[model samples]
Target: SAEKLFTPLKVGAVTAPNRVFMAPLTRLRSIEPGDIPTPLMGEYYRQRASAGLIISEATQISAQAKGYAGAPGLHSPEQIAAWKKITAGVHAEDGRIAVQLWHTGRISHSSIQPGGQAPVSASALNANTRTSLRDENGNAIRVDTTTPRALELDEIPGIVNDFRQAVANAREAGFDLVELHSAHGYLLHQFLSPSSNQRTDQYGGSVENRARLVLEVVDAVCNEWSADRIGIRVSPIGTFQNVDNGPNEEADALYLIEELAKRGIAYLHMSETDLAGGKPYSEAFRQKVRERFHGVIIGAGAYTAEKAEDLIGKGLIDAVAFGRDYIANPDLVARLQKKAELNPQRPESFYGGGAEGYTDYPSL
Candidate 1:
């Protein structure tokens, strides 16, 4: 039965036990101040070690890209040592894991960025939609980011090196692969979306140029880990940090993905809906990407068991990353295998603190 859904898929040289990957889920469990992964984090990930592959939550690569207080980082020796335990646990269980390295760009405050440097972006444009970051006391503090100072061309390579060193750190931590978190309007996506990027430099303007940073990061990460052990995740239609791709969005996206394919990267992770705009992903959008990207494609965002199977059966996707479903159901793949009813998720228990939503969810 697993031959259908549990077929082993090769992303470069890394062999996934099944085609179903656990999409990176945010748990905000990092130890504060330094934002290090704790021993408890090892336990949480070890519990879900049955998944074919697990993409760790958004983790900062450098202090300059750090945006969330509780978000973990791979740039520190302590951080790397902390993560080794988690990776050991997964490997002990015969599971694969990848660390999703992140950079938040302008979506940060002075407290998060290094040297108190101005939060940088492709351009200084601020998101019209204001969101809040949690304060030290766990209060939702409102913020409307002021215009970020545009990055100087001379300083670009240093930013790229940040990711390079991050990949090195992840390797030391014993991760099977490393994923550049280019999705969700972090540093890389901030440069990709036309709405957030208004720069005239070689890093901006045309679609190819705007996608330069993301591809560069991918190159750096893949250089550290083999092509088969590296992946890049993008949300073409999804909006985070108030970024939007607009009407002809899909056209630019296809071009970007094709470029990614040419790089011989292992896989492309895509979230095809406008989560902020409340628009669902259309079949047409998925088809366009399916045609353009020749490498392994992992589809994420709002996929049901039937939907995932239908897409796989048709050979449209290599894998599906279940987000909320995997959160409430640690044995999500097993339940889907047995066609069992799922336990509903408690929204209030999703975000803040502890083992309740982190590892307490039941398996079938």
Candidate 2:
């Protein structure tokens, strides 16, 4: 049935047992105050260890990188220790795991930013999207994103440095590989997309300039970590949080992908359109990506087993990261292999909460 989905895939340093991967889903359940990983998180990921690989939820690299109240971080020693245990749990279940590092950029409110200051982005722009803030009762409250203060050019290298430290931390946390969150309208994407960036510095303006910071971050990351052990996510045709590209959106992403391939990076996780809504990337674009990046290509954005199989058969993507599927079905690969019914996800409990809607989702 889903024979192609069940095949092994060589995703850089790790050999995924199948072509099905657990896309990083942001479930704000980490311990608050410090944003440390909880033991429950370990159990949640361990249950889903059946996937080819599990990409951890988008993790902040620094305190200032936080956009949500309960999201986890990789900058602190305690955070690293917590993730170390989480990684060990997955390994115990015979699963491979990677951490997805991100800086939310302008998609954040001052209430959640470190020291209650303005969040930094490629420019002083408003994402015009809602971000979550924790009320006194630790409940998520929807609030408009604060207009971000444009980052000083002098501080650009620090953003790159933050990512470098996170990659090093992932290695110490026993992760199989590290995936940089360059997608989803976050900081890196803010710079990459003209919709959010209009700076005149070397880090902005043209396509080559917009791609500068992301490429520089990759170069800095590869300086410490092996390119084979590194991967980056990109949304060439996606629109989210009011961050979409213009005429050169695809051009900038293509340039970045070519540069990444030249550096021998592990894989490219392409998040198409919006996972929730938007036009899907064309077949022509997917083929262009395949031709450019020789390592691995992971296709994401609302894909079914049959759709994933067809895409794989056509030599489009090496694998597919099932987001909501992985959320509801811990044993996603097995269920797909057997064509079993999936567990329905409770949308209300998707974000902040305890184990009820999370680790309690029974496995086959």
Candidate 3:
């Protein structure tokens, strides 16, 4: 009888008034030299405070975690201070926001890493996809990612340490929630996917072994804060950033899902394979997901209000996170409520631009 999307849903400590949320998108608009967020970035999010929940862009946990130019970080005082204004503004508007934490891993070029060091990953593999960088004129450009060296067994604890510290920083920055970016062929995804992680070490090989690093990272984070305040984003199957699941992709994801459910975390975000024009997640896999994780589940990747409503009604997912629509329509919830047409987004201005396509999108 009621609109499925307008229903209230609890994501750990934060409660969303509706099921429509803003997906984490990399806009590459953070300030340069320090990779800091700006007042305009705060204002940009302030305008879209109407969404049920706003997932901040993929923020690098440390300087070595950066793979993209203009992306913000959670490692320094200045970065935390800049993010404070953004979170405060969102809270002032009665909006729930979460910062998505991540490390680029093999997806990073040496030039972007601290001291021009090679990026670290599950194995010393080369990614076919390109990472982000800034040109001399400040335009965002795509360059081939450099080959990354495999992390030594002893260095794994430091990676876990980075996540734990970033979780503390997110709390200091006033974020209501923190979503670990384990999807999209990033550092964690590199560890999760068997194809990318070919190590015979304890952190690789078997499904449990490959999932060890992610679980360890989660353990460190849970030690720092309530597991209820944490969520994880995982792409069960995809070629995003040139990383795909091996024959055991589903088993790999399901095992991790079962483990996460055991941890009693806030929610699990499933970044479906549909973003690249691939087929949507099968209903069979959805049932498997529901079986393992009984708590909150959010699904993203090329969803419309109608499609999201269908999935919610079907009980496959609890919420829908819109990417491009949220980019072009700040009042996305209201527009969807009334079935109003959304403003078309300018692909050219989606990244590395000032106010034009970022904050200038008018609301009805």
Per-model tally of clashing residue pairs: 1, 0, 0
Clashing pairs in 1: 12-228
Consecutive 10-residue window with the lowest summed lDDT within model 2: 245-254
For 41-119, candidate 1 gives per-residue lDDT tens digits of 7887887788878999888888777766577888888888899999999899898898898888877776556776678
Q: Give the alpha carbon lDDT tens digit for every residue of 1-364 in model 2.
A: 6668888899888899899999999999888889999999999999999889999999999999999989999999999999999999999999999999999999899988889999999999888999887788887778899989999999998999999999999999999999999888999999998889999999888888998999999999888888889999988785777788777666667788888899898899988858578887789877888898998999988898888888999998899999988988999888888889999988888888788889888878
Candidate 1, run of 10 with poorest lDDT: 126-135
Quote the positional error of residue 316 for candidate 3 in Å. Answer: 1.4
Q: Tell me, what's the RMSD of every candidate?
A: 2.1, 1.0, 1.1
lDDT of 3: 0.91
- TM-scores, in order shown? 0.93, 0.98, 0.98
**How displaced is residue 245 in candidate 3, in Å?**
0.8
Which 10 successive residues of model 3 have the least lDDT summed? 273-282
- Poorly placed runs, candidate 2 (over 4 Å): none
Off by over 4 Å in 1: 1-3, 129-132, 136-147, 274-284
Higher TM-score: candidate 1 or 3?
3
lDDT for model 2: 0.90
